[PDB]
């Protein structure tokens, strides 16, 4: 998939011929309850971050782009990616770096008196130019130099960030309603409670802990020896929906106490009808858009392309490792082309561009993973699950009375479960666990039986320094430089690491398929 053909659009054509023969199997392989359980999982797992990021975007951009535009873009891009992509297990949705770029671009447009949405239209227009040149010149072959080092560093960092944000949301919930000796019983509730309320933060903590506990116990019960095997596996597959339903019913049977619920818009309308319409004129809405920004938008378009490219390609590398039993193939050229082109098209309608997020796609792959008697058996590789998730995301506005009864704390426990389950296949997490173990308890694995203990510990600690550096960058206004610092790990693997480690040590510690040299 990463070979260079030398022909224009050579990678694009090979990716199509690699996967599209399996298009008929991509529908028939979904006839299983595990696919439906994965749909119910990924629907909430993509809807709740979408709602949160849409609210943040509306707050930070004066509602020029908000919840409704993000939901519509997510639905359309997910549907078109599931119908036409080469790796349908990827989940197309909004991400944090995209929000940071939107913040920076809105600030830049406000400073220079530029129309933000027209600048977004021009950036998306420049986005289409970049992706066509990259795909035609086989620019997606450069991802072959991203070995297990950078992939696992990025995945571990993203999982830690997800867990940190999940806990910080509960911390903010506690700060909004602190535990006090006295409360004001006359507190306005619309649109949100303007004062602290009793029993709120504690009930949110209880709901999150119970959701996480039930999810983990059902995950254990899947591999357990109790019940008949078919019924036990069916229950284990629906473990996350069962936990969500149980905690939702628990919160529903507590009428008096208030808990924050999901909030979707009233209808399929723009967030601000006083600012922009559904189609934004590239020449300007209120003021004439200057000519110079039409060429100056290439650099922000370059940054957006770098962000989306790194995110989607590293996610595709993670989800398509040979150890995950992927036997249908993935496309690095077709998927990138589809994602960036759809982002550029949606930019014309004033809708946010999206990328293949890491945590959501990894959770989608894991929810379709079939486990044998410890050993991964197969993966339910099909296009129906992502298509149904996107359709339900689009229909989330019409089903407000169902979503309005689901607390966020249940979703917080679900996100914690996703974060703790996204660290399974990372060897960096395994070697971090070996830092707190005696050397005699280390497993019989190639990177332990052929490498000395202190050498492996030093190799792991080098990655820890990279994780700390990447975390510090995110805590700075220049968090859009995170892709560049992440790329800087690739020279570290191929220039500085060989200066201290032998060839066999680097082969064992950084192996493309976890082999013993």
Partner 1 sequence: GERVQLAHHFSEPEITLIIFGVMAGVIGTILLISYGIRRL
Ligand X SMILES: CCCCCCCC(=O)OC[C@H](COP(=O)(O)O[C@@H]1[C@H](O)[C@H](O)[C@@H](OP(=O)(O)O)[C@H](OP(=O)(O)O)[C@H]1O)OC(=O)CCCCCCC
Ligand Y SMILES: *[C@@H]1O[C@H](CO)[C@@H](O[C@@H]2O[C@H](CO)[C@@H](O)[C@H](O)[C@H]2NC(C)=O)[C@H](O)[C@H]1NC(C)=O
Mapped onto helix, strand or coil, the DSSP state of residue 87 is: coil
- Pick 158 or 275: Cβ nearer ligand Y: 275
Under 8 Å between Cβ of 368 and 380 = yes
The SS3 of residue 261 is strand
Q: Dig out the tokens for 236 from the structure.
A: 């284990």
Residue 288 binds partner 1, judged by CB under 8 A = yes
Among ligand CLR, its own copies, partner 1, none, what does residue 444 contact (CB within 5–8 Å per kind)?
Answer: none
Q: Return the range that interacts with ligand Y (CB under 6 A); candidates 183-191, 230-238, 242-250, 270-278.
A: 270-278
Q: For the chain, how many residues are written?
A: 517
Nearest to 233 by CA among 44, 365, 422, 372: 372
Query: Which lies closer to ligand CLR via its Cβ, residue 96 or residue 350?
Result: 350
Query: Which of 56, 82, 128, 356 contacts partner 1 by CB under 8 A?
Result: 128
Checking phi first, is residue 329 left (phi over 0); if not, alpha (psi -120 to 50) or beta? left
Binding its own copies by CB under 8 A: which of 51, 118, 157, 203?
203
How many residues touch partner 1 under the rule CB under 8 A: the total is 26
Does 209 bind its own copies (CB under 8 A)? Our answer is: yes
First-to-last CA distance in the chain? 23
Least CB distance from residue 230 to ligand X, whole Å? 6
Given the complex with partner 1, which of 164 and 278 has the nearer CB atom? 278
Q: Toward ligand CLR, which CB reaches closer, 294 or 511?
A: 294
Q: Looking at beta carbons only, is 2 or 370 nearer to ligand X?
A: 370
- Quote the least distance from Cβ 242 to ligand X, whole Å: 15
Name the residues that contact ligand X, by CB under 6 A.
227-229, 231, 436-440
> Residue 275: which of ligand CLR, partner 1, ligand X, none does it interact with, CB under 5 to 8 A by kind?
partner 1
Which uninterrupted H or E stretch holds 377?
Answer: strand 376-379
Q: What Å distances lie between residue 200 and 192, 244, 309, 430, CA to CA?
A: 13, 19, 41, 37
The interface partner of residue 462, options being ligand X, its own copies, ligand Y, none and the CB cut-off 5 to 8 Å by kind, is none
Element (H, E) at 513: none
What would the DSSP string read from start to end of 367-429?
HTEEE----EEEE---SHHHHHHHHHHHTTTTTHHHHTT-BHHHHHHHHHHHHHHTTSS-HHH
Report the residue number, 292 or 436, with the smaller CB distance to ligand X. 436
Q: Of ligand X, partner 1, ligand CLR, none, which one sits near residue 229, judging by CB under 5 to 8 A according to partner kind?
A: ligand X
Tokens of 221: 């019960």
Residues in binding contact with its own copies, number by CB under 8 A = 27
In the complex, least distance from residue 397 CB atom to ligand X, rounded to whole angstroms: 39
| Interface residue with its own copies, options 6, 113, 191, 229 (CB under 8 A) | 229
In sequence order, what are the residues at sequence separation of 6 or more whose Cβ sits closer than 8 angstroms to the Cβ of residue 485? Answer: 469, 470, 473
Query: In this chain, which residue has its C-beta nearest to ligand CLR?
Result: 125
The residue with tokens 């280390």 is: 442
CB 272 to ligand Y: min, Å: 4
Give CA–CA dist 141/232, Å, rounded: 43
When CB distances are held under 5 to 8 angstroms depending on the partner's kind, the choice from ligand CLR, its own copies, partner 1, none that residue 291 binds is ligand CLR
Query: How does strand 92-93 pair with strand 369-371?
Result: unpaired
Query: What pairs with residue 499 in β-bridges?
Result: none
Distance separating alpha carbons of residues 443 and 420, to the nearest angstrom: 21
Q: d(Cα 90, Cα 58) in Å, to the nearest integer?
A: 26
Q: In this structure, are residues 332 and 15 in contact, taking their beta carbons and an 8 Å threshold?
A: yes
Q: Minimum distance from CB of 449 to its own copies (Å)?
A: 17
Please say which residue, 322 or 461, places its beta carbon nearer to ligand X. Answer: 461
Nearest-angstrom CA–CA distance, 506 and 489? 15
Which chain residues interact with ligand Y by CB under 6 A? 62-63, 272, 274-275
Interface ranges with its own copies (CB under 8 A): 178-183, 185, 198-199, 202-203, 205-206, 209, 225-229, 254, 256-257, 433, 436-438, 441
Binding site for partner 1 (CB under 8 A): 8, 125, 128-129, 132-133, 136-137, 270, 273-288, 348
């Amino acid at each position: 998939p990463l070979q260079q053909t030398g022909q224009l659009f050579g990678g694009l054509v090979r990716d199509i011929r690699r996967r599209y023969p399996y298009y008929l199997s991509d529908i028939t392989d979904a006839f299983s309850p595990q696919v439906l359980a994965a749909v119910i999982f990924i629907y909430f797992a993509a809807l709740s971050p979408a709602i949160t990021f849409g609210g943040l975007l509306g707050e930070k951009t004066r509602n020029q782009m908000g919840v409704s535009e993000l939901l519509i873009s997510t639905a359309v891009q997910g549907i078109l990616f599931a119908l036409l992509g080469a790796q349908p297990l990827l989940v197309v949705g909004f991400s944090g770096p995209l929000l940071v770029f939107e913040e920076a671009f809105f600030s830049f447009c406000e400073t220079n008196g530029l129309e933000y949405i027209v600048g977004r239209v021009w950036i998306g227009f420049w986005l289409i130019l970049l992706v066509v040149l990259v795909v035609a010149f086989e620019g997606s072959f450069l991802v072959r130099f991203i070995s297990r080092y950078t992939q696992e560093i990025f995945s571990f960092l993203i999982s830690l960030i997800f867990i940190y944000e999940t806990f910080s949301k509960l911390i903010k919930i506690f700060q909004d309603h602190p535990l006090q000796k006295t409360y004001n019983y006359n507190v306005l509730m619309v649109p949100k409670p303007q004062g602290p309320l009793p029993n709120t933060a504690l009930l949110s903590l209880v709901l999150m802990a119970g959701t996480f506990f039930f999810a983990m116990m059902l995950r254990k019960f899947k591999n357990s020896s109790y019940f008949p095997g078919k019924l036990r596996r069916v229950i284990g597959d629906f473990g996350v929906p069962i936990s969500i339903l149980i905690m939702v019913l628990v919160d529903f049977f507590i009428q008096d106490t208030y808990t924050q619920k999901l909030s979707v818009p009233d209808g399929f309308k723009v967030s601000n009808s006083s600012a922009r319409g559904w189609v934004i004129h590239p020449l300007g809405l209120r003021s004439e858009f200057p000519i110079w920004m039409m060429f100056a938008s290439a650099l922000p378009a370059l940054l957006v392309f770098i962000l989306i490219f790194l995110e989607s390609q590293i996610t595709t590398l993670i989800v398509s490792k040979p150890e995950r039993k992927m036997v249908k193939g993935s496309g690095f050229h077709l998927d990138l082309l589809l994602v960036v082109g759809m982002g550029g098209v949606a930019a014309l309608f004033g809708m946010p561009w999206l990328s293949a997020t890491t945590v959501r796609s990894v959770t989608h792959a894991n929810a379709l993973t079939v486990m044998g008697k410890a050993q991964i058996q197969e993966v339910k590789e099909q296009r129906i699950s992502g298509l149904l998730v996107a359709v339900l995301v689009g229909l989330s506005i019409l089903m407000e009375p169902i979503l309005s009864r689901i607390p966020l704390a249940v979703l917080f426990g679900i996100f914690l479960y996703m974060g703790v389950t996204s660290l399974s296949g990372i060897q960096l997490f395994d070697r971090i666990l070996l830092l707190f173990k005696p050397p005699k308890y280390h497993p019989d694995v190639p990177y332990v039986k052929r490498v000395k203990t202190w050498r492996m510990h030093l190799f792991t600690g080098i990655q820890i320094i990279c994780l700390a550096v990447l975390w510090v960058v995110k805590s700075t206004p220049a968090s859009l430089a995170l892709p560049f610092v992440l790329i800087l790990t690739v020279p570290l693997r191929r220039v500085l690491l060989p200066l201290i480690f032998r060839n066999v040590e680097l082969q064992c510690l950084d192996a493309d398929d976890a082999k013993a040299t």
